[PDB]
């Protein structure tokens, strides 16, 4: 039951029953991201296959320097008299037409309004789902 949850069941699989009272609007989350640097124009990609947390973030520094890849690339990284190429604090822009997305939803489950302690507000839990589990239920269903 929903009131029998404790510290033991954390990072473990549980089976639960209840009634639905809330269903939010579908949100957009990324799966494949293509990015570019606004100073030097370096390009890369990102792939996400873990959408359960509610995390990947955009790189904080340009990856052109740590990937000293081409022999002329480490030469284009220098110049401007005497100084070191500094792209900036966070220089990555998302190219949206080249990225892919998926759907995410929030639900609230409530204990059966009948077997509740007398004189106390029913307790509820917050649940998250995505991809092929969205729009499968409506509020009022057990």
Rule CB under 8 A: which residues touch another protein? 19, 21-22, 25-30, 36, 38, 41, 43, 56-58, 90, 93-97, 99, 101-104, 108, 110, 113-114, 116, 118, 121-122, 124, 138-140
Q: Which is closer to another protein, CB of 43 or CB of 68?
A: 43
Sign for the CA dihedral angle at 61, 63, 68, 73 comes to negative
With CB cut-offs between 5 and 8 Å by kind, which of another protein, Zn ion, none does residue 1 bind? none
State the binding partner of 73 from another protein, Zn ion, none, CB within 5 to 8 A by kind: none
90 binds, among another protein, Zn ion, none (CB under 5 to 8 A by kind): another protein
Please count the CA atoms within 13 angstroms of the CA of 70 that sit on its side-chain side: 7
Tokens 């939803």 belong to which residue? 105
35 binds Zn ion (CB under 5 A): no
In terms of Cα–Cα distance, which of 89, 83, 40, 45 is closest to 65?
A: 40
Q: Which residue's CB is nearer to another protein, number 27 or number 76?
A: 27
Taking the least distance from each CB to another protein, the nearer of 3 and 96 is 96
**CB 103, min distance to another protein, A:** 5
Q: CA-CA distance, 26 to 9, in Å (whole number)? A: 28
3-state helix, strand, coil split of the chain in percent (to 5) is 5, 30, 65
Cβ proximity of 77 and 47 under 8 Å: no
- List binders of Zn ion among 77-136 (CB under 5 A): 87
The Cα 22–Cα 19 span in angstroms is 10
Chain contacts with Zn ion (rule: CB under 5 A): 37, 39-40, 62, 87
């Amino acid at each position: 039951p929903l009131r029998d949850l404790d510290s033991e069941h954390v990072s473990k699989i549980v089976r639960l029953s209840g009634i639905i009272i809330s269903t939010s609007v579908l949100s957009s989350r990324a799966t494949y991201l293509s990015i570019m640097c606004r100073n030097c124009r370096h390009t890369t990609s990102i792939t996400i296959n873990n959408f359960n947390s509610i995390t990947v973030s955009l790189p904080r520094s340009c990856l052109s320097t740590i990937e000293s890849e081409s022999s002329m690339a480490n030469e284009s990284n220098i110049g401007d008299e005497s100084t070191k190429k500094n792209c900036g604090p966070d220089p990555y822009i998302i190219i949206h037409e080249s990225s892919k997305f998926i759907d995410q939803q929030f639900l609230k489950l409530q204990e059966i309004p009948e077997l509740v302690p007398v004189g106390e507000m029913p307790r509820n839990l917050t649940m998250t789902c995505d991809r092929y589990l969205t729009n499968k239920v409506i509020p009022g269903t057990r």
